[PDB]
Amino acid sequence: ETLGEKWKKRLNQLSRKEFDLYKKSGITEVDRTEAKEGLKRGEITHHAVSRGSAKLQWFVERNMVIPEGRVIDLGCGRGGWSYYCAGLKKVTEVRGYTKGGPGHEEPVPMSTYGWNIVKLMSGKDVFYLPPEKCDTLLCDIGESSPSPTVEESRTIRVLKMVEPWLKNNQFCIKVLNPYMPTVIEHLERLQRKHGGMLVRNPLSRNSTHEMYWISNGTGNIVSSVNMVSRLLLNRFTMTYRRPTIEKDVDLGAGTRHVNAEPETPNMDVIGERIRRIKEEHSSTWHYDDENPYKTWAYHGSYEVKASMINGVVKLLTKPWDVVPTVTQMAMTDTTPFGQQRVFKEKVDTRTPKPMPGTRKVMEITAGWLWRTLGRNKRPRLCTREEFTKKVRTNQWDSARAAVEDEEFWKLVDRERELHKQGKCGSCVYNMMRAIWYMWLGARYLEFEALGFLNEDHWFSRENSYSGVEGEGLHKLGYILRDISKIPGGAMYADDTAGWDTRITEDDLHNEEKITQQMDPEHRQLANAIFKLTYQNKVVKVQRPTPKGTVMDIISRKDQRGSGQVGTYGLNTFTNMEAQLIRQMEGEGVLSKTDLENPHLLEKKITQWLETKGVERLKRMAISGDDCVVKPIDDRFANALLALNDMGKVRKDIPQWQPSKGWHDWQQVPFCSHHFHELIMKDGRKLVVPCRPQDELIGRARISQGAGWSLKETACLGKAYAQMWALMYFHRRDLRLASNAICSAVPVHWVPTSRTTWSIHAHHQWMTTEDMLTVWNRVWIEDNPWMEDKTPVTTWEDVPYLGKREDQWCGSLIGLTSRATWAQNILTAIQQVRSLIGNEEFLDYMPSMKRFR
Amino acid sequence: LEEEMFKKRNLTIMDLHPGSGKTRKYLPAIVREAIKRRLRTLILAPTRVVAAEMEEALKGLPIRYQHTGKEIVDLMCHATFTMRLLSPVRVPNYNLIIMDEAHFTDPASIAARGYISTRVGMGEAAAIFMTATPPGTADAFPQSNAPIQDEERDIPERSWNSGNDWITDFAGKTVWFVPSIKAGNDIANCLRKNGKKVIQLSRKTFDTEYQKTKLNDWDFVVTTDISEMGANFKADRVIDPRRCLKPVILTDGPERVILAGPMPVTVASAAQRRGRVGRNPQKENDQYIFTGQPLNNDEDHAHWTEAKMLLDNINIIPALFEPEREKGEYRLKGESRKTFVELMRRGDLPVWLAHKVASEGIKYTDRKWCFDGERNNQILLRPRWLDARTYSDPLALKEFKDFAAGRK
RNA sequence: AGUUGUUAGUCUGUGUGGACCGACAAGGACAGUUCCAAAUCGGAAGCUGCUUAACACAGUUCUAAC
Ligand SMILES: *OP(=O)(O)OP(=O)(O)OC[C@H]1O[C@@H](n2cnc3c(=O)[nH]c(N)nc32)[C@H](O)[C@@H]1O
Numbered sequence A: 001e002t003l004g005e006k007w008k009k010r011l012n013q014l015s016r017k018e019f020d021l022y023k024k025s026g027i028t029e030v031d032r033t034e035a036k037e038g039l040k041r042g043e044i045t046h047h048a049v050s051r052g053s054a055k056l057q058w059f060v061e062r063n064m065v066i067p068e069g070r071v072i073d074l075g076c077g078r079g080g081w082s083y084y085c086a087g088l089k090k091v092t093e094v095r096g097y098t099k100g101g102p103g104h105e106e107p108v109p110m111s112t113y114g115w116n117i118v119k120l121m122s123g124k125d126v127f128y129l130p131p132e133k134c135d136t137l138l139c140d141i142g143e144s145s146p147s148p149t150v151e152e153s154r155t156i157r158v159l160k161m162v163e164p165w166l167k168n169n170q171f172c173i174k175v176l177n178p179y180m181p182t183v184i185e186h187l188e189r190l191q192r193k194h195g196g197m198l199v200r201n202p203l204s205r206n207s208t209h210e211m212y213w214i215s216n217g218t219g220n221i222v223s224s225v226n227m228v229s230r231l232l233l234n235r236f237t238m239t240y241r242r243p244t245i246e247k248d249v250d251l252g253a254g255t256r257h258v259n260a261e262p263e264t265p266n267m268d269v270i271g272e273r274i275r276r277i278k279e280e281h282s283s284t285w286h287y288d289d290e291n292p293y294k295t296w297a298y299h300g301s302y303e304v305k306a307s308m309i310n311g312v313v314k315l316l317t318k319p320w321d322v323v324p325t326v327t328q329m330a331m332t333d334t335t336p337f338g339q340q341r342v343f344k345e346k347v348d349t350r351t352p353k354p355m356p357g358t359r360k361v362m363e364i365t366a367g368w369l370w371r372t373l374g375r376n377k378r379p380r381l382c383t384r385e386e387f388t389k390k391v392r393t394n395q396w397d398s399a400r401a402a403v404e405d406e407e408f409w410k411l412v413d414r415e416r417e418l419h420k421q422g423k424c425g426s427c428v429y430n431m432m433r434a435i436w437y438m439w440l441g442a443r444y445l446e447f448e449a450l451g452f453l454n455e456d457h458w459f460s461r462e463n464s465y466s467g468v469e470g471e472g473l474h475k476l477g478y479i480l481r482d483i484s485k486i487p488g489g490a491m492y493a494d495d496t497a498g499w500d501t502r503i504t505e506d507d508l509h510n511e512e513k514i515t516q517q518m519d520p521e522h523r524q525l526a527n528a529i530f531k532l533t534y535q536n537k538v539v540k541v542q543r544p545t546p547k548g549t550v551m552d553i554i555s556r557k558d559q560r561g562s563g564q565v566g567t568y569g570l571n572t573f574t575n576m577e578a579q580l581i582r583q584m585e586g587e588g589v590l591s592k593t594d595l596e597n598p599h600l601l602e603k604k605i606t607q608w609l610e611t612k613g614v615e616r617l618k619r620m621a622i623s624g625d626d627c628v629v630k631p632i633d634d635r636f637a638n639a640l641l642a643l644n645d646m647g648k649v650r651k652d653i654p655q656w657q658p659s660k661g662w663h664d665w666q667q668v669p670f671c672s673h674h675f676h677e678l679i680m681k682d683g684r685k686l687v688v689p690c691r692p693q694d695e696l697i698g699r700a701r702i703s704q705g706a707g708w709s710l711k712e713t714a715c716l717g718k719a720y721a722q723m724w725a726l727m728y729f730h731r732r733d734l735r736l737a738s739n740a741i742c743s744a745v746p747v748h749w750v751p752t753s754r755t756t757w758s759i760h761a762h763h764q765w766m767t768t769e770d771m772l773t774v775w776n777r778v779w780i781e782d783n784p785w786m787e788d789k790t791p792v793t794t795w796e797d798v799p800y801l802g803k804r805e806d807q808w809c810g811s812l813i814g815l816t817s818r819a820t821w822a823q824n825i826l827t828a829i830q831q832v833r834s835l836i837g838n839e840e841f842l843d844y845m846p847s848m849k850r851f852r
Numbered sequence B: 001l002e003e004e005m006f007k008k009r010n011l012t013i014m015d016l017h018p019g020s021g022k023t024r025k026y027l028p029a030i031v032r033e034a035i036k037r038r039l040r041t042l043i044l045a046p047t048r049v050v051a052a053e054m055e056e057a058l059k060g061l062p063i064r065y066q067h068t069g070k071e072i073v074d075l076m077c078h079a080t081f082t083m084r085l086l087s088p089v090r091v092p093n094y095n096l097i098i099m100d101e102a103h104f105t106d107p108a109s110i111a112a113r114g115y116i117s118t119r120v121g122m123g124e125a126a127a128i129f130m131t132a133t134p135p136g137t138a139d140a141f142p143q144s145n146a147p148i149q150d151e152e153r154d155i156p157e158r159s160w161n162s163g164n165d166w167i168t169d170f171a172g173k174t175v176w177f178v179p180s181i182k183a184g185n186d187i188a189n190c191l192r193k194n195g196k197k198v199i200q201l202s203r204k205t206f207d208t209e210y211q212k213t214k215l216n217d218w219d220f221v222v223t224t225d226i227s228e229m230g231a232n233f234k235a236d237r238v239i240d241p242r243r244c245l246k247p248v249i250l251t252d253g254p255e256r257v258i259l260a261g262p263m264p265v266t267v268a269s270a271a272q273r274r275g276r277v278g279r280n281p282q283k284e285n286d287q288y289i290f291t292g293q294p295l296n297n298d299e300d301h302a303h304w305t306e307a308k309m310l311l312d313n314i315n316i317i318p319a320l321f322e323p324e325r326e327k328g329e330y331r332l333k334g335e336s337r338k339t340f341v342e343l344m345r346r347g348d349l350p351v352w353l354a355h356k357v358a359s360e361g362i363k364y365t366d367r368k369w370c371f372d373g374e375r376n377n378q379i380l381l382r383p384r385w386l387d388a389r390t391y392s393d394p395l396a397l398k399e400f401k402d403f404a405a406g407r408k
Numbered sequence C: 001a002g003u004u005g006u007u008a009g010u011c012u013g014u015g016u017g018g019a020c021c022g023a024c025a026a027g028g029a030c031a032g033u034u035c036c037a038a039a040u041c042g043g044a045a046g047c048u049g050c051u052u053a054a055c056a057c058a059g060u061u062c063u064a065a066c
């Protein structure tokens, strides 16, 4: 009696609750909520029809089976596998079959990427089919029953049906019951006939013992089956573990045109860089052929090598263990698997070339805008010592080292004169000592040529009428309010899906138009950067193969590299022009006809600009891809023509449904915050930033930036607490937690290791002072919207979000767990202090009127 | 050397891919610095063999090899530190602690790591773990002095009447890993049957065979994971079938201890196995034949539970290593704890069993449970619990029989 | 396999509905005198000194029985 049948019986002998839990012990499961919502709604893009997509992705990713050419799928069902396959490099034509009908799934027509080449056919049973010539085969047919014999027989029929299709081609076939002897023997005979191995997919629930026979792989069938069975047995109770979650798959949108996809690189422009890379690792430069790169040109590969929960916080925020989001934030992975997945679903696209009318419009607008932005300031080259300052005052440490070094500077000078000639030698960046010097040097060159954008605040609210550079969180609220006072329609804030991947060439040219203002010396360098490292970019990425990780070299022309200096400036600029155009269309100045014709007269548009541009600009807050716009009238909620044509598609809404605009400005999201208005005791009003606390809690329970160092993790916790006491004091839970933590760490452990990476965090809390005074300085003294400058004296006049409002933003008040916590934080602190040792311990609890 | 590393409240995992002078170069200098900084220090070693190697590499510095007396820095095996900690003598206060082979699997080793980490957290310690694979490692193909030519193939499980020539056709010495002595004997018989001088190694035979290995006569060497630690070969190829065995708990009703069958190895184990070759930049043919994917969830193994028992019973809630925390009940009262220490030390019972006995407060003499086991709780002698370790090999059975008889 | 829930109550919103309104507050939470809130009082209504409904329809309200 084989083990598999033992487990089959044992499972049969379970009850509703027992079986219900046992089917979900220690398995990965993909979040299908959002997908269920979108499909119930009736969306057509960005959504896996079923859970089949992730399941097949797990195989495809590890190259265990590689789709190619024509792909034939049997039992296509709703069609998750077919659609997932459509969006792959080699794939050319997909045909999916199923008997269809009652109790059986049906294909769900969609329009995710590659839909145009998918033919799904219901009403056709696979069993009676004339086996056709298949380059890649997929089969997912299986009907489980409590009777193992029935499943065995069904499996046998399946294998018989699917034998005549394997003609030296990549394949993946479901095997439902692999632990039946006759099944094992048939599999072995087929393996000898064809090869390939048998694998278990971690997604498949505990309730079944299915495996998959796949083309690319070897091993021993029997032992693997035994291993699976042993796992299941060990997992019957195993002090049941909750199932790990993963992020679902995306499938882009739109039709897929193969002939226009691949790219031809200006090999003369990047050849030196590619050659230098190849020379540097001249051992392992093995040109691959399993490279999954649709729109990025390829150059080769080479061998390469490869969160933690902060204890101090974890010990003091117990009640948040059951909270799904707090855990979910933690279980996110940046392994090569994750990075490859993200690159596949996000960056390997191609945005259609816009209509000529749009191109002319954008050209005009960009020229006008750049001329405006330079109404007073004028660009200048940056200087080395400035770069020294920026590094020193804050890879940081090594960066200081390298800047203080010497040979680095000579290297920079050499590459720089190369730039002056018009070629680039080490300007290459990675999508996360000698090579590291090259990288840092390229950053320095960009800083030298395009640093004036930031060092001089070209986009400050005063200068650009829309940008909010240099404000920080404690002022975005006031800016939003001042927007809300301007007359007009509702307020819209539409987030652009994957902004960086959505920068077409024309945008880059427009952004380059700024060179029409520099001085020849500067202009040469800036042209160098623009035309060599922005418009022709070369990137190193990591990919896992069934040998290890290897770096792959890719190149492209669009899609600004997110690590580059001057990214924020240019992003804000392009965003501004885009929103301006959208307002234009809203006010009717632009029509479809104007977009279509190759030469629309510029006079009308230029007139509108020079008359109303500054006024319209003052109706926006722009920061990177984040935008807040208040048009005069709600026709802006329909000006989707130009926006789509420029290729900046909104996120999570169908491509033509109108925007949805809030009216209360305390609801408009911006830089992942919303903003609330509070009344102090004196009646003085405050505007503070609020985000659903669960994110705050999770983000302060993640000890990234430290492997294992309690002295470090405590200081990170203290830093988080101080930031909480400075920018989130109005959340009760947060204030309590912050007071506890601050009283729960030595009173002289100066924190470090920045708590956030947003540009909008001036980091007033990284000091070692006493909070109350600094809070006064931040919000009372130096706040221009604070007419009455009477300082607060104790943490009692500091306001509080209204109870229902605090509950509505994720606070745990009113629940017994929090109550007991609230009561016994004193013991918790005592325990943590004990763990720490013998350093001093001040008590910040008496600051609340609950502990006096 | 970063001198700041010697601040208290500082534990650092350093590493050096095999050889590299991690012991041959760095460690004597580290001890030299600690002596100059006049720091009461401890050193922890995994096994007697590694202890002897460190002794050889520690020529000149005063080390209390657990000697003459009144040193400052001592050296001992990790499990020795564990047991000495368990015994109610106030453990000596060391300022600094160096620990080699930190990816070890002995429950005493895990508990030693936990205790050292907690002592650092107490703010009165400095810790240095010198190992090439931390908990949380997943890079099964890490650096090496020479690059390692990998290949996945069809590693045979038993003797083959014919085929698998790629195994024998090598021009270079082959080091092959096997999960049991019997399988080693079979494969060695086959290889010798092809006229290749072979050498089998095991837990017991290592003492007599290792020096023979140190001679240059042999060509094909089969071993279990004993060779996984400190066994210089200067070989050419490694055949690591990524099959292994381990003592794992199993609940399945009666929670017991079972010696697992063939099994894919942990990521770290396979890493060490691969790193048992390619330790010289002069060489090139660093071929590594793998035929498996390392295990996914080693959370079912038992040495974690036993190490938890050791740490909890240790005399602030005891807490494991942070990266190993992902795997306060087992603590027992005075008399029961003393009984547990006794049954571990005198009766030679593996940790889980001794803790189970001491939980129910049976003083060391009483052996009622050794026969009170149920019908199915028999052997091929009815102990209250089942642990295949107690009856796996004939020698193990003989020792367990001696214990159950009251002769031990 | 995938597809998957079903019935009861509770919890939201609406609608009908005379259908609630005040006064107070045990207790609770909260830690900003900040919000809830049983009881009790009074008011009104309805059928005669007792009641403050009733039901519906939708909640991604939850809870339990297939
Ligand atoms: O993963 P999936 O196959 O969709 O789970 P199923 O519910 O379809 O289970 C299929 C397989 O599992 C056994 N089974 C289903 N429901 C069960 C239950 O309530 N109690 C027991 N003991 N077994 C159960 C069934 O044998 C079927 O073949």
Ligand SMILES: [Zn+2]
Binding pocket: A415, A419, A423, A424, A425, A426, A427, A442, A533
């Ligand atoms: Zn360059």
Ligand SMILES: [Zn+2]
Binding pocket: A674, A676, A690, A691, A692, A809
């Ligand atoms: Zn809020």
